Design a protein around this ligand. Sequence first.
Ligand code: FEC
Length: 309
Amino acid sequence: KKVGLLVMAYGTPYKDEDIERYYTDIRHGHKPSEEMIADLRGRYHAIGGLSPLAKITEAQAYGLEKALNDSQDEVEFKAYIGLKHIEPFIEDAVEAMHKDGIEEAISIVLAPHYSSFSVEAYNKRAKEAADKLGGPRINAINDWYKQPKFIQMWADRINETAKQIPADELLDTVLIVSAHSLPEKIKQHNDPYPNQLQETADFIFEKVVVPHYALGWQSEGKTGEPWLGPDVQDLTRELYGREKYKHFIYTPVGFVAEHLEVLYDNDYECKVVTDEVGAAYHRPPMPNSDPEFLEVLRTVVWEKYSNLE
Ligand code: FEC
C-alpha cells in the first residue's frame, strides 16, 4: 500500500485566456475590473507571456516522489499535485487520492514558512476535503525552513554569486532576504510568519561571506490596508541612501521557484531601483527542481514519515 504525497502550491494560468478566472479565484471569487486584469496580463506579458511555475511545480512534485522512492523501500510514495487557485485544486488532489484507495497521506506546501494566510489555508482546505470524502488521513507539514540543507542551499548560491563580485566591493555588498508580504494585521496575533523569515535570514547570514543583510517583503496586494514592510523596492532606495551599496543580492527565500513574483517583482522592479541608484543587481537561481532542492524536500518528508511511525 502506498502513502499519498499531497504536494501543494499556488497555481498559475496555463494559457493567456486563463488569467481572468485565475485572478477571480485569487480575489476570493470577486471578478477584478478590466483595469486590474490588464495590469496583471501586462506583467505576464513582460516576463515572456506566461509563467513557468506549472512545469517547475510538476518537476518538484515528481522529482520529490522519485527521490523518496529511490532512497528506501519501507514505503511507496505517490505524489498528487493540489493547487490553491487553478485546477487541479487541493480538493481535486484529495479526491483522486481517495478514489485511488490511498488511506494515509503526508502533505507539504511548496513554501517553507508558515502563516495563517498561506499554509493554514492549504491545510484547512485539504482536511475539509478529506473529511467530506472519508479519507485519506492527511498528516500535514507546516513549515520546513529550519532544515539545515535548505539553509545551506541558499548560502551556497549566495556565496557563488559573491565570489564573482570584485574583492574590494564585497564590503559594499548587501544581501536582501525576502518573501511575499501579508497584511500587517497578522503581527497583532503573533502569527509566526515574520519571525520565521527573520530566523531564515539570520541562519543564512551566518553562512555567507556577504557582510551586510536586511529583511524585506515583496508583492503586497491591492487592498486598502497596511502590509508587512519594508517593501524590497523601498528598502533598496533607503539602504543606498544610507550606505551607498554597490551590489544588491536578492534572495526571495519565501519562494521556491522562478515565477511571476520573482521574474517581475525582483528581476524587473528591483532592477529598476538598482539601475536608478547606479548599483549592480544580483538574483541567484531559484531552487526550482535542482537535485539539491529535491534532497531538501526528501529530507523533510522522510523525517515526517519517520515521526508518524
Ligand atoms: C503568502 C503568498 C504566497 C506564498 C506562499 C504560496 O506559494 O502559497 C503567494 C504566492 C504567489 C505566487 C507564487 C504567485 C505567482 C503565480 C504565477 O503565475 O507565477 C502569486 C501571484 C499573485 N498573488 Fe500571491 N502569488 N498573493 C497573496 C499571498 C501570497 N501569494 C496575497 C495575500 C494576495 C492578495 C490577494 C488579494 O488581492 O485580495 C496575493 C495576490 C496575488 C496576485 C494578485 C495581483 C497582485 O496582488 O499583484 C498574483 C498575480
